[PDB]
């Protein structure tokens, strides 16, 4: 054909991470009636101008190039916007070069946080004390946030700790300065410490279909030998998916049946102490999907009212965003564009400048989907659905001549007899000659009203005339 | 820190396509008792030897360097094999440099296949005829396989066609040679043509969780205006997800409820011709998951029988392969290693050589998963559960001296009185002096049997002796 609006051949894939210093080539593959132009956008900011270059090449990736990219295609018809593509860049910074200090009273839990370091993705850490690798045991844990946890600390736990971090994507590794941990011997060598949850499980929301999800719970008590950390769901202790001395519970292939509350509980076996409990909540995000899409192309008559359907579902409920030619309707500030609460678009009076691509985006916390349509608004020249015919009407009785025309917008109809005008939209005021929808009615009719009449229906595009002779018979 | 078998901190992620000439960094991030060593494998072939370097770096990635990579971690305890990672390289070759010719009779469908070109991934195409971009219409379609299909060809459709292919990953573009198409005018301009399916929909198997899938169906008829191609499933025409003049049916978020058969049908609206039909079948692959995993560490006594659980479900049913220290049990040809049909491992008699990591892999047509355990086979020194006690027994009656021990392997028990050995595993013959399991029974007992007795239990590790006095009373 010779009048095709743009449409994409292929949409962006899943987000991806790339190494610093590598070459990146984004492509914008769309088809449509020429001349096609492409503009590139990063983070809702225009990067390039429109050109015949559908590619975008970064010869050496930096960390600042990371973000969300998307392409815009445009020809004479309209503009279409590509879905987001998430380009991440792998980097790892350096530790602040200064030692730190921390003090813990004897028996309490010692929690050493990973010293600040910017890294993408999260680095894998290996903790060290006096040159010896610290491997987790019943008394030592390494939380998911790379924090070291020493349970039931004694005087022998004092010393200088440090960590060695490795970024699993670029292989870079950095060694931190020291954290000097000191233990105060005030609590005593012999006592009993009620179980206390040091690291509680947190609420989690998982996109439906993910491989696995993990929960953690660290607790402190003394004697640590008798400390038991267990997971309850639906009032029953769980046994499957447990890791790291019962401190980690993993849901493999989580589904809607796994949502709800999980309860971490720590008890000191054989003690009169009340247990420690912490609640966590698993929910699942359903990425959006359309239940109502508009047809690909939509024809419209001017001055008409248009409704473009767009409804989408998801968990949580998706949000709809309307664009016209890659411009959000919000910034267009067109008062005639009203967005229905269902999500559909409502256009009051169609004007020729409303032609172009309309786009609907459904967004969740875990997805985004797009639909679009081409709106074609054209003018219709006036035409006669039924022309007036010659008629004979008895004196004193009413007479009606029909002159029905179709046009966009509605043609202005003017009934005139020879050189004088009898009725119009502006003028329907003399001798009870009435203009009704589609025609003229004279009531009553004298012989002085006899003669031939002409109906002039005019539009912004053209004008048309229809003649018909009326003869008045004697009473 | 000693006594900790290896285990990975992170496993490889989903496959990604990389550009030619980019830097590639694979990491083998595992923790465990030092000294740790690492080896690298590509396609069942070692790349590196064992060393203290956990990284593998390709400064300039080439097409030939594509393949499957994995690392093996090893310390004094055993060896552990990482999940394979798929390294794909984006490339785009050229077309075979020669023109081709094709002929179609006026009214038939003309199917032009994309000329041969090797490219990863599959290139997007734009079709041209005499320097004009061919845009799909009701009469012209571009298949999912980049084929151009012209329905109801006329003499005005003859000419030289060519395609321009673009690789969406690296942006390269190549232009094919010419297909000189001629249209024979034998059948005639004035006639009707029955709907005939040209491009049939293909069977599709899709891994569960994929975004979308699409069947295509292209049919030819004349007049092409009256040709309607629609999709029926379960005897009902589908209205959701129709694309490109009804020729494309797209299942969005395909789940188990979407599997089965789909039927394409093409009719000439208002004709006495029978409709044309074509069946297609959609199935869904469920990646493997474990339903039974072994414990992280398993302690075992020598000469005993061991069973290691490994079950895994999925669609299709997964295949399970076993390894011992990164060596497949099939290659080991060990007769004491029997693989259960449920997937479990069965070890007949535990020998100290059986110590080390065992690793179960579950793989299907759409995934692979890993579980492992460390088997520690040790010897247990003999220890008395109950030593012999002083006893007084009436002459003629039976008597029992109890000497029960625990050890691995089973301690050989030798019952001796003074310098003479009354009973042993080798000798249990004399005077109905019988060796009960863990004890000595004299039946009957004469006055000559009085005195104190000693029990000698010995394994390969050590030997222990225990004595007790026996006094016989007169009848
Ligand atoms: C473009 O937007 C992305 C996403 O909002 C930004 O990426 C974030 O960067 C900040 C700091 O650099 C991090 O704390 C976030 O974790 C990143 N991701 C997200 C999802 O927020 C990126 O920085 C933006 N680029 C520019 C130039 O503003
Ligand atoms: C490693 O093996 C893989 C497959 O076992 C090879 O990749 C295949 O190569 C053949 C022919 O070169 C292609 O037809 C397949 O499409 C490839 N499959 C892929 C890429 O998944 C690979 O070439 C081997 N490695 C090396 C270095 O040759
Ligand atoms: C954790 O969530 C509780 C309930 O909130 C809802 O349910 C869980 C599954 C979450 O997914 C959350 O997004 C939902 O809104 C709250 O009662 C509780 O306060 C939350 N805890 C927090 C926010 O720290
Ligand atoms: C299409 O498939 C039919 C059924 O086979 C099953 O479904 C397909 C989708 C595959 O997943 C296959 O592994 C399954 O066994 C076949 O009976 C039929 O012959 C196939 N037809 C063609 C043209 O391949
Ligand atoms: C990275 O690891 C190596 C291996 O031990 C080590 O020698 C080197 O010091 C580490 N780099 C840093 C910056 O600590
Ligand atoms: C209407 O009047 C104009 C002007 O006289 C004339 O050109 C036109 O032909 C008339 N319409 C028809 C249908 O004849
Ligand atoms: C094809 O590639 C050439 C150079 O590689 C480039 O100049 C041109 O713009 C590309 N596109 C077309 C349509 O030729
Ligand atoms: C065992 O018997 C011998 C001789 O019959 C005797 O000398 C010895 O004291 C006895 N053992 C004990 C522990 O009395
Ligand atoms: C008997 O046991 C003792 C004590 O365990 C040990 O010293 C001795 O070597 C054993 N054997 C003999 C023959 O005394």
Author numbering:
A (entry chain B), B (entry chain A): 1 to 475
Give me lines lifted from the publication on this model.
Sdk1 and Sdk2 are single-pass transmembrane proteins, with extracellular regions composed of 6 N-terminal immunoglobulin (Ig) domains followed by 13 fibronectin type III (FNIII) domains, and a relatively short intracellular domain terminating in a Postsynaptic density/Discs Large/ZO-1 (PDZ) binding motif. Here, we report the crystal structures of cell-cell adhesive homophilic dimers of mouse Sdk1 and Sdk2, each mediated by the four N-terminal Ig domains. These four domains adopt a horseshoe conformation, like many other IgSF cell-cell recognition proteins, but they interact in a unique back-to-back anti-parallel manner not previously observed. Overall, our data suggest a model in which Sdks form cis dimers on isolated cell surfaces, which dissociate to form trans dimers through the same interface when contact is made to a cell surface expressing the cognate Sdk.
The Sdk1Ig1–5 structure showed that Ig5 extends laterally from the horseshoe with a 54° deviation from linearity with Ig4. This angle is maintained in both independent Ig1–5 chains observed in the crystal structure. The linker between Ig4 and Ig5 is only one amino acid (N379) and there is a small Ig4:Ig5 interface with a buried surface area (BSA) over both domains of ~370 Å2. This interface—involving the linker region, the Ig4 AB loop and the Ig5 BC loop—likely provides rigidity to the Ig4–Ig5 junction. Consistent with the AUC results of the wild-type Sdk1 and Sdk2, the crystal structures show a dimeric arrangement of molecules, consisting of symmetrical back-to-back interactions (convex-face to convex-face) between the Ig1–4 horseshoe regions of the individual protomers, with Ig5 making no contacts in the Sdk1Ig1–5 dimer. (A) Surface view of the Sdk1Ig1–5 structure showing the back-to-back horseshoe-mediated dimer observed in the crystal structure. The positioning of Ig6 is therefore unknown, however, since Ig5 projects away from the dimer interface it is unlikely Ig6 would be able to contribute to the dimer observed in the crystal structures, which is described in detail below. (G) Our data suggest Sdk dimerizes using the crystallographically-determined interface, both between molecules emanating from opposing cell surfaces (in trans)—mediating cell-cell interactions—and between molecules emanating from the same cell surface (in cis)—mediating Sdk clustering. These interactions are shown schematically, using the Sdk1Ig1–5 crystal structure to illustrate the dimer interaction.
